[PDB]
Enzyme design. Sequence first.
Site, PDB file in Angstrom:
ATOM      1  CG  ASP B  30      -1.922   1.003   1.301  1.00 40.37           C
ATOM      2  OD1 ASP B  30      -1.671   2.119   0.859  1.00 40.37           O
ATOM      3  OD2 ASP B  30      -3.010   0.742   1.859  1.00 40.37           O
ATOM      4  CD  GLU B  82      26.238   2.781   7.481  1.00 39.92           C
ATOM      5  OE1 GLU B  82      25.634   3.500   8.297  1.00 39.92           O
ATOM      6  OE2 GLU B  82      26.011   1.571   7.339  1.00 39.92           O
ATOM      7  CB  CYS B 114      23.869   6.746  10.615  1.00 39.91           C
ATOM      8  SG  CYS B 114      23.145   5.314   9.850  1.00 39.91           S
ATOM      9  CG  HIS B 249      20.235   9.387  12.126  1.00 40.28           C
ATOM     10  ND1 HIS B 249      20.759   9.562  10.866  1.00 40.28           N
ATOM     11  CD2 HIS B 249      20.008   8.060  12.263  1.00 40.28           C
ATOM     12  CE1 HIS B 249      20.846   8.393  10.260  1.00 40.28           C
ATOM     13  NE2 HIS B 249      20.403   7.465  11.086  1.00 40.28           N
ATOM     14  CG  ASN B 308      19.229   6.109   6.207  1.00 36.67           C
ATOM     15  OD1 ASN B 308      19.932   7.038   6.555  1.00 36.67           O
ATOM     16  ND2 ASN B 308      19.065   5.026   6.957  1.00 36.67           N
TER      17      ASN B 308
HETATM   18  C1  LIG Z   1      11.576   1.159   8.990  1.00 37.53           C
HETATM   19  C2  LIG Z   1      11.234  -0.287   8.841  1.00 37.53           C
HETATM   20  C3  LIG Z   1      11.510  -0.993  10.137  1.00 37.53           C
HETATM   21  C4  LIG Z   1       9.768  -0.410   8.524  1.00 37.53           C
HETATM   22  O1  LIG Z   1       9.531  -1.748   8.446  1.00 37.53           O
HETATM   23  P1  LIG Z   1       8.175  -2.493   8.279  1.00 37.53           P
HETATM   24  O2  LIG Z   1       8.199  -3.504   9.298  1.00 37.53           O
HETATM   25  O3  LIG Z   1       8.055  -2.914   6.953  1.00 37.53           O
HETATM   26  O4  LIG Z   1       7.119  -1.375   8.559  1.00 37.53           O
HETATM   27  P2  LIG Z   1       6.063  -1.224   9.740  1.00 37.53           P
HETATM   28  O5  LIG Z   1       5.197  -2.390   9.795  1.00 37.53           O
HETATM   29  O6  LIG Z   1       6.787  -0.906  10.965  1.00 37.53           O
HETATM   30  O7  LIG Z   1       5.205   0.017   9.360  1.00 37.53           O
HETATM   31  C5  LIG Z   1       5.708   1.294   9.354  1.00 37.53           C
HETATM   32  C6  LIG Z   1       4.645   2.274   9.759  1.00 37.53           C
HETATM   33  O8  LIG Z   1       3.727   2.392   8.694  1.00 37.53           O
HETATM   34  C7  LIG Z   1       2.417   2.249   9.176  1.00 37.53           C
HETATM   35  N1  LIG Z   1       1.564   1.828   8.055  1.00 37.53           N
HETATM   36  C8  LIG Z   1       1.560   0.672   7.469  1.00 37.53           C
HETATM   37  N2  LIG Z   1       0.661   0.615   6.502  1.00 37.53           N
HETATM   38  C9  LIG Z   1       0.082   1.776   6.459  1.00 37.53           C
HETATM   39  C10 LIG Z   1      -0.940   2.411   5.645  1.00 37.53           C
HETATM   40  N3  LIG Z   1      -1.504   1.694   4.690  1.00 37.53           N
HETATM   41  N4  LIG Z   1      -1.276   3.627   5.916  1.00 37.53           N
HETATM   42  C11 LIG Z   1      -0.703   4.305   6.861  1.00 37.53           C
HETATM   43  N5  LIG Z   1       0.240   3.821   7.645  1.00 37.53           N
HETATM   44  C12 LIG Z   1       0.657   2.592   7.493  1.00 37.53           C
HETATM   45  C13 LIG Z   1       2.586   1.282  10.277  1.00 37.53           C
HETATM   46  O9  LIG Z   1       1.464   1.273  11.115  1.00 37.53           O
HETATM   47  C14 LIG Z   1       3.828   1.816  10.969  1.00 37.53           C
HETATM   48  O10 LIG Z   1       3.516   2.909  11.745  1.00 37.53           O
HETATM   49  P3  LIG Z   1       4.205   3.279  13.154  1.00 37.53           P
HETATM   50  O11 LIG Z   1       5.413   3.999  12.777  1.00 37.53           O
HETATM   51  O12 LIG Z   1       3.291   4.048  13.820  1.00 37.53           O
HETATM   52  O13 LIG Z   1       4.557   2.057  13.706  1.00 37.53           O
HETATM   53  C15 LIG Z   1      12.040  -0.937   7.733  1.00 37.53           C
HETATM   54  O14 LIG Z   1      11.820  -0.242   6.525  1.00 37.53           O
HETATM   55  C16 LIG Z   1      13.513  -1.095   8.028  1.00 37.53           C
HETATM   56  O15 LIG Z   1      13.945  -2.011   8.617  1.00 37.53           O
HETATM   57  N6  LIG Z   1      14.248  -0.136   7.567  1.00 37.53           N
HETATM   58  C17 LIG Z   1      15.670  -0.140   7.708  1.00 37.53           C
HETATM   59  C18 LIG Z   1      16.145   0.174   9.094  1.00 37.53           C
HETATM   60  C19 LIG Z   1      15.729   1.495   9.628  1.00 37.53           C
HETATM   61  O16 LIG Z   1      15.761   2.449   8.977  1.00 37.53           O
HETATM   62  N7  LIG Z   1      15.429   1.513  10.917  1.00 37.53           N
HETATM   63  C20 LIG Z   1      15.315   2.730  11.621  1.00 37.53           C
HETATM   64  C21 LIG Z   1      16.039   2.544  12.881  1.00 37.53           C
HETATM   65  S1  LIG Z   1      16.059   4.111  13.648  1.00 37.53           S
END
Ligand SMILES: CC(C)(COP(=O)(O)OP(=O)(O)OC[C@H]1O[C@@H](n2cnc3c(N)ncnc32)[C@H](O)[C@@H]1OP(=O)(O)O)[C@@H](O)C(=O)NCCC(=O)NCCS
Lengths: 417, 417
Positions: B30, B82, B114, B249, B308
């Site tokens: 989505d 990195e 980072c 960050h 990022n």
């Molecule tokens: C960031 C990361 C963890 C997201 O992973 P994911 O498990 O696929 O995503 P999530 O299930 O957590 O969903 C992200 C957000 O989108 C929201 N979301 C999902 N579908 C949605 C939709 N259709 N409409 C609105 N929001 C939505 C979720 O509810 C969640 O919200 P929250 O921040 O309030 O929790 C992932 O992209 C990742 O590992 N990235 C690399 C590491 C990183 O950057 N980490 C940050 C460390 S600081």
Amino acid sequence: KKRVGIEALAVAVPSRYVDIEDLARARGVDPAKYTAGLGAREMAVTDPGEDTVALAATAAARLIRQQDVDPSRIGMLVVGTETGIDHSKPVASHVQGLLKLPRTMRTYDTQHACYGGTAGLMAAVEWIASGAGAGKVAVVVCSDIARYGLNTAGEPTQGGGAVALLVSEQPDLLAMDVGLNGVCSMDVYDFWRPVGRREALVDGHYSITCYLEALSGAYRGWREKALAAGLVRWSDALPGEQLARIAYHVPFCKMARKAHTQLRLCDLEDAADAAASTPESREAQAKSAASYDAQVATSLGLNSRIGNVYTASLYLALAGLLQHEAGALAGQRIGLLSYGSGCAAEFYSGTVGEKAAERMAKADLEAVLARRERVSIEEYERLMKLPADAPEAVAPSPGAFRLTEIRDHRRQYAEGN
Amino acid sequence: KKRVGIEALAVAVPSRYVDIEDLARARGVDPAKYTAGLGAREMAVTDPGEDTVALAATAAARLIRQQDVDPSRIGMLVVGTETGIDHSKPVASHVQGLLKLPRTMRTYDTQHACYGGTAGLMAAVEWIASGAGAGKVAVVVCSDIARYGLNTAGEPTQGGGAVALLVSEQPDLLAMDVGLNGVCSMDVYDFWRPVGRREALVDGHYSITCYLEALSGAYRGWREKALAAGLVRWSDALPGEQLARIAYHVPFCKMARKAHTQLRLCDLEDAADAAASTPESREAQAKSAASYDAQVATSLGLNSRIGNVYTASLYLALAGLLQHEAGALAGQRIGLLSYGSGCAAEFYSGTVGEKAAERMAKADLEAVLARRERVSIEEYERLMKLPADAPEAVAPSPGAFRLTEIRDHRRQYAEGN
Ligand SMILES: CC(C)(COP(=O)(O)OP(=O)(O)OC[C@H]1O[C@@H](n2cnc3c(N)ncnc32)[C@H](O)[C@@H]1OP(=O)(O)O)[C@@H](O)C(=O)NCCC(=O)NCCS
Ligand SMILES: CC(C)(COP(=O)(O)OP(=O)(O)OC[C@H]1O[C@@H](n2cnc3c(N)ncnc32)[C@H](O)[C@@H]1OP(=O)(O)O)[C@@H](O)C(=O)NCCC(=O)NCCS
């Protein structure tokens, strides 16, 4: 007044070494090429359990124990290395965890070939001298494993180990002259090691020329500032002769003689009366055995028994010098030349402290060197052929560390009992 | 009195980007998960010609040109990354050569995920504040390419680029409060990238917890020192509310809201009257839309269009904030939170300068962003599948750089006309 610099140091070495004459014979090389030509005696060799982290952590833990450092006073933990084991996660973070250090410190690695340790040292010194580190200490670890490969020109200059430096406002080993450093850097391909390549690429004779070129610029930059500060003078003595000792980065031990001759040539070529001399007369004076013996010769005892340890080599030279002469040197100013391929050199000075001999006694360096075992060239070759993720099934010595395995891409370590 | 900090900055971005909703559709996701859930708009994508060196050199050359820096005043050139491209030879040495910089400078790279850029920034600031760098400047470049891989959880948080920082005694952007930093570091496996692995390993939700944990410790450490220095008070305003802005960050843009809520919770939990509150009441206050809007919201314009950029992300947030608000912020103190996985966080503060708007105008950041071209997900995937030694046959923009080939293991670059 206020002082900043190196308070103490500790050394870790691999558990095994080879006799350098055995290597020569295995390669069909005259052993005098290595013993006389290069100045080598013994070469540290590793297995994959003695990785950059294990050596760094062994040295840093030894420093903390030997010097009774309060870990919660450490505000910076920096690892200088060109033997990194992750693109992202620094050796310094692994060392922090293995040592169970607390959280109120910067952690990172510094990288520029054999200059990375010095870069980190200056960052720690200047953190303290800025006032930001007042009341705290830093630990800067130089850790590396020098690998050129079987049957390569660089093979007899291999080695490995780590030197951990305690940096503080109580710089008992070396109270550094802040702001007087000379530096010279330029983009070159004298030595490099592309990502994923286990063995270095090097044009060894070009690397010698780059070392000597960068040394000349760095030394001249320091000398100009030292002259202006009144620390040395153009007198009947050359400026560089007024340093009690000079320690040099040691890729192989005979490099120190080349470096010292070049430093002296810088003085002889730059003297206001240089026009009265000839290249022949300047070279003969520059090569003075008396000057080398007085200023440099006693700095090579550890290096000759270990090999090139890249970022740590200069600091193993400092260690060997102070191991035996710290009391004599208290109150005297010495010089230090750091070089790294790629390249950069930095020349700096400092004064040895009254308590340097105490701190060196606590480093117990002959015991560190005595724990090692000799192995065959055959066994060295077998260990070289092991993949980096295949440590030998061998316990660490008490208080030391080894990599044990990589599981799900996570490196696992053991601490010796 | 004496001041030290960031004088100016410049930005380089890859030549291509994708629309983040296109990525979602290609992945059967989505699109609101990316636009609302993560806060993304556009994601920089690279080809192998836009390596760490090319991006760093583009940014550093742009800084020198835009700000009319005298290259011979540079005494330190540090690259935080990195995304290193050699175990030995630092990105900083390549940048030095590409820019044809002179020799009287330290060169090295700093590494801690980072956080590496901030580590280098502090080394440069403290070099100057120690007196060693008096009269000179440093250039600290944050350069990275964030790669998680096709069909991975981290893929929508990819990006790339570089931010070059000019560091000096004329810190027109940010006069840093030397010695007040808070730091929190601990050994974790939240994100890492083993040598030779092109794509990162990450436990994304654990990385969020580590970020927020380390932020809390770093922020509390700064706050204690700022209270003692009289810069903030426990008053009717929370200590953190007394900073005009806070930049964080940004691995993904919605992380800034999480981070700001956590910072405010630190104040609310630590207040002498915390016992009178509940988790529900503290969370509702911490999540204040008014505070986020007042202190944080305008810092994300560049990040949302790039992705990022690891070491550079905080500094792209600073750039976006000052791009529009530097005049308003002159004379005001702001806070900055740096995080790197592995992990370490550092919280610091400084005062925006009277000339910050001038320096930002010269950075011409809308032009930097406007030079880019959108590509398809199909083309992004094609470029991702290229080996790192296979740059596209494409010229650099004027004054920018690209890797052109690797020949005999030596990296070759071109400068755009
Ligand atoms: C960031 C990361 C963890 C997201 O992973 P994911 O498990 O696929 O995503 P999530 O299930 O957590 O969903 C992200 C957000 O989108 C929201 N979301 C999902 N579908 C949605 C939709 N259709 N409409 C609105 N929001 C939505 C979720 O509810 C969640 O919200 P929250 O921040 O309030 O929790 C992932 O992209 C990742 O590992 N990235 C690399 C590491 C990183 O950057 N980490 C940050 C460390 S600081
Ligand atoms: C150091 C290195 C260049 C030596 O390489 P090499 O080409 O095999 O060795 P060389 O031919 O230069 O010989 C080394 C010395 O041994 C001498 N030598 C050779 N055989 C000898 C013998 N039988 N008896 C005595 N001396 C001998 C040579 O005359 C030479 O002396 P010199 O220093 O006065 O020139 C090589 O090991 C290398 O590349 N090492 C890695 C990089 C390095 O450390 N470089 C240092 C840069 S500062």
